[PDB]
Amino acid sequence: SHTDIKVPDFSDYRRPEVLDSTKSSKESSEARKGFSYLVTATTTVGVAY
Amino acid sequence: RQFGHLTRVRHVITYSLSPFEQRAFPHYFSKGIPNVLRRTRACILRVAPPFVAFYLVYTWGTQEFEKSKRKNPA
Amino acid sequence: RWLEGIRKWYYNAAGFNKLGLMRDDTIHENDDVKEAIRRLPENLYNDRVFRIKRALDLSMRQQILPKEQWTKYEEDKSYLEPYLKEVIRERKEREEWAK
Amino acid sequence: DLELHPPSYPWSHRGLLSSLDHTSIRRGFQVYKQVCSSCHSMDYVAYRHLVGVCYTEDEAKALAEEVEVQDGPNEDGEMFMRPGKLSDYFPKPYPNPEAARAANNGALPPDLSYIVRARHGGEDYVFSLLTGYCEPPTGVSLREGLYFNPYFPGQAIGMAPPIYNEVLEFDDGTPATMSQVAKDVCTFLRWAAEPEHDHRKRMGLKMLLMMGLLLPLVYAMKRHKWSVLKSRKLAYRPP
Amino acid sequence: VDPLTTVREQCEQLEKCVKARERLELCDERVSSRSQTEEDCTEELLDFLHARDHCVAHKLFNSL
Amino acid sequence: TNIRKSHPLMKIVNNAFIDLPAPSNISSWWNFGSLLGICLILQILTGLFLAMHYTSDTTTAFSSVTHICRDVNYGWIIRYMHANGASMFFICLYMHVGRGLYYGSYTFLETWNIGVILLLTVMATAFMGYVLPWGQMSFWGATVITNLLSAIPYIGTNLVEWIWGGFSVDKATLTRFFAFHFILPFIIMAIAMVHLLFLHETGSNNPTGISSDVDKIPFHPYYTIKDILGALLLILALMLLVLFAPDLLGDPDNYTPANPLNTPPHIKPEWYFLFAYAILRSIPNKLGGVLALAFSILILALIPLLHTSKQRSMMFRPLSQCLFWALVADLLTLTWIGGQPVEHPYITIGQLASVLYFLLILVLMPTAGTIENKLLKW
Amino acid sequence: IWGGFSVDKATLTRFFAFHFILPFIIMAIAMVHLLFLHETGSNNPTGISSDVDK
Amino acid sequence: TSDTTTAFSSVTHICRDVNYGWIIRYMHANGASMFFICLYMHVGRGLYYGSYTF
Amino acid sequence: APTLTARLYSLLFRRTSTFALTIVVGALFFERAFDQGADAIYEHINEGKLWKHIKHKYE
Ligand code: HEC
Ligand code: HEM
Ligand code: HEM
């Protein structure tokens, strides 16, 4: 059956914030985006200069 | 040729994560260093030997040019 | 016979086995090979498709499989030979007829 | 035709981020002025070039006024001679190259504007040449006027040793030894050939820092986007 | 008074210099002793100066 | 439906730039195309800005170039960007070609041959560029290299004087070299677009030399972000030269003005021609030497026909790999030898290196392919 | 534009450089010009659609 | 040449010393006129026949 | 309070309009800061060598 398919373990790849499977990712969503977009924003300020 | 007209593929599953769910550099040194050494060892005696040979024919020819320009004891 | 020592050596040196490829996956696709591929049965074709997908994905990561997972020299079936041989044999007949 | 290449002297501007010693330039200019400028031209350096480098506007105006230069025509239709100003270039000793040869027994003294850049070794080369004049070895002599220098190609030059102890009194009162006079003039000839030196290196530092910032940031952006693919697992599930 | 000619002497009294200076003096009183041979001694001088002025470079600029 | 696939101008951009299906696995050696484009655009801008200040008259020429570096605002940084940018171009070119050779991308015949043309055009451009400052190496380089064409029987001697527009490299030669040098980059840009037009017929090759249709990724964002990173690294290399060693890849003798009497000690072209300059000097006969120098480049057109291996890439081919790296090391030897005076041991090394160049391409690497095949029962 | 306080040395030199490059820019824009024309095809003297008689 | 001193001289040097330089020079000058004749005629067509709707 | 990166997101990086205005403000403040800071590093590395350092002697 297709019910035999279950998603592989991605623990190795995950951010620390989303490791805990019993907690909601939504707490960390505000933060995780902030970090990655800051990198992009910093880059743009540098390129601008 | 557009996406959707490339080729025929059957029964191949692909799981993947959002870049916001994961790290940019997971085990970057931990797994990176050994993989580099493996990659380097794999190609070293294909890549290196000709440049060894260049280095030798170069340093030989350079100081051969120097010796030849000196006067000979006669 | 006697060069079988070198054939086995070359096989591992070449190293397509490290990506879980068989020899006939590495054949450069000309017009004959295209036709040979086109003639493969569902099973043999989808295996080819996956083996390559796997190899390309490994190449993308600059990694190889575990040594247990490498294609053994002895277990490398020449899967494309019967199709390719006949595709070529056919074209040579048309080329003959054309003269 | 053997060859002795110069050693690498530790100049105050040797390093990647090291500027020219501008007080050394100020001295070195005077070594061109007092010693060279009666033999070598330096056509690409004007008196305005000195301002904000080794001299003030007012100092450079005084140095310019000190020299003759032709100008014209006036309304009568004649070519007169006038006191120099900032817009004037450093004046050539002779009216042409053919006149220059005659004054130096056939040999043409090269223009010094780019001599650091136009000779292998640069300031290391010139310094060795100026200080390296010595007595010839046994078995050797050139034509009467061609001197022995071990750093010149072919071992024989057509220039009289131009620098020695106290050939000039310096404006800031530095003891004018032969090696001090050579060091200073080289530092000036470096600036002559490459005025951009100090700005170039300022830009270099700012480039290295921005690249220090942007490369790992852009590299992080790369790994971020690509992380969808680096993570992915495949599965083959035939019926 | 020149710092240069002080240091040229200082460097001259090193093993690599004095051995090259002896090489120079060998052919000095080989060519100036023998009669009519077109061979000279530029080579030996340059060997000596190479070793000397390398050392001179390393500490001349301290006195300036 | 979107206005990326609809709009006639955006359609070309969307298909050749954004939604382009690219192999998942292409390496750093695939960045060099993008970098060649950046080089070309970089040369055009810097070049155009220099041309606002330069003059092609023989008397004022050297002076104008120096006037740029001393009086024109940031003229120096523009000038040395353009000179080192030309080096960066050729670095990018040989890396780009090497990729093609190693991974067998040359099987894309039209793409490849247009490449050969592009190479030859960039060469012609850069040869004539180096003349424009009108220094010693400029003038004497141009004189020796042009005058090789006199070795052609019957016509050669006329041909040379017709290029020159006189009896030596003089007033008319410099002025026309400025005009040709201005126009050619624009011709390059056109041919480069045709180059890609044929590439987008097949899509890209990859490191395996196995078809990648089963695993294509869209060009954006994957390769837009990689190409940005590449561009960044190209700018670093360029600016490291421009701001820390702008004279490193040139020659000093091009800082003294051109003198038709006074010959420089060891006259030579710029570094990126040195390999082929060495090949020229290997053959004792002059016309032979010219035909060898010409065949040292044109042989690129012959590479696809010389392909013997049943596998496309050298990835799975140890013998070819070594022979390839030998061919690279040999080219590095020819560049070194090209820079040397014509004497022992550089004559013999040069001869031996030139023999090995043509031997590697025409005999050894084809043989190696067929040996590899017979080792795989093929 | 002038590169000075009148039309002089720097103006003439840059006018030569711009005058050289611009025709090539024209050629490009002219190709885009036709690229859009071949979206619709040509108008004709009647100002009535000519699809019925091409 | 775009140098202010030699510029006028170079254009005349074309017309007098350069082989068929005159016919090239005056073709280029009248060719510029022919261009603008062609341009205004081309625009006029567009206006009269309403091709500008494209 | 949510984390600092999170505050940055909600205030500056969420609306693309604020994201761009952030970049333009930041670019100004970076430019002046970087220039002044890097110049200091350069001129300290070349203490007493520059015209800027020896200017006072002739004024
Ligand atoms: C009265 C004559 C005279 C004076 C004084 C003089 N020069 Fe020269 N210089 C020459 C001549 C003549 C040559 C050409 C030598 C030759 O080609 O053999 C020359 C050549 C040079 C060269 C070129 C060496 C080479 O590699 O070809 C440099 C550098 C140079 N001079 C610098 C100086 C400096 C620095 C000073 C003083 C601070 C100076 N000169 C003073 C006449 C002079
Ligand atoms: C101005 C010079 C050139 C430019 C701007 C240029 C541009 C490009 C670009 C953008 C690509 C796609 C990206 C890549 O794979 O690198 C490409 C691919 C290619 N170019 Fe070039 N190129 C130039 C010169 C050459 C030369 C000299 C050759 C060969 C002699 C060549 C042969 C190829 C080939 C074979 C490919 C396909 C690579 C593949 O799919 O694996 N090009 N070129
Ligand atoms: C493939 C593109 C190009 C290459 C490889 C190239 C190469 C070169 C080289 C090697 C020089 C000599 C640099 C030096 O030693 O100073 C040069 C000079 C010059 N180039 Fe280019 N060039 C290119 C495009 C252009 C374009 C498009 C223009 C003008 C529109 C231009 C204008 C000039 C000018 C005016 C000079 C003389 C100034 C100088 O010496 O820097 N070039 N070029």
Ligand code: HEM
């Ligand atoms: C270098 C300048 C130009 C070139 C090379 C050029 C080229 C062409 C060509 C080859 C055609 C198709 C043949 C024809 O109907 O004449 C065309 C059509 C057209 N051009 Fe131009 N053109 C240029 C300038 C202009 C200008 C200045 C305008 C308007 C202000 C314009 C508007 C049009 C229009 C509206 C058409 C469509 C005519 C129709 O279908 O009835 N063009 N152009």
Ligand SMILES: CCCCCCCCCCCCO[C@@H]1O[C@H](CO)[C@@H](O[C@H]2O[C@H](CO)[C@@H](O)[C@H](O)[C@H]2O)[C@H](O)[C@H]1O
């Ligand atoms: C005794 C042990 C010998 C082993 C070590 C070898 C180095 C010792 C020097 C021996 C001579 C070497 O041989 C050296 O080869 C080159 C290249 O062919 C010669 O160069 C000459 O021959 C070639 C032959 O094609 C001509 O095209 C060329 O015009 C001419 O200059 C040198 O004049 C010669 O000196």
Ligand SMILES: CC1=NC2=C(CCCC2)C(=O)C1c1ccc(Oc2ccc(OC(F)(F)F)cc2)cc1
């Ligand atoms: C058009 C392109 N096609 C492909 C690849 C690799 C993967 C697949 C095919 C590329 O990197 C690619 C490309 C090429 C050039 C890029 O930047 C440019 C640089 C110059 C340029 O101008 C011009 F026309 F080439 F002269 C146009 C674009 C950006 C991307």
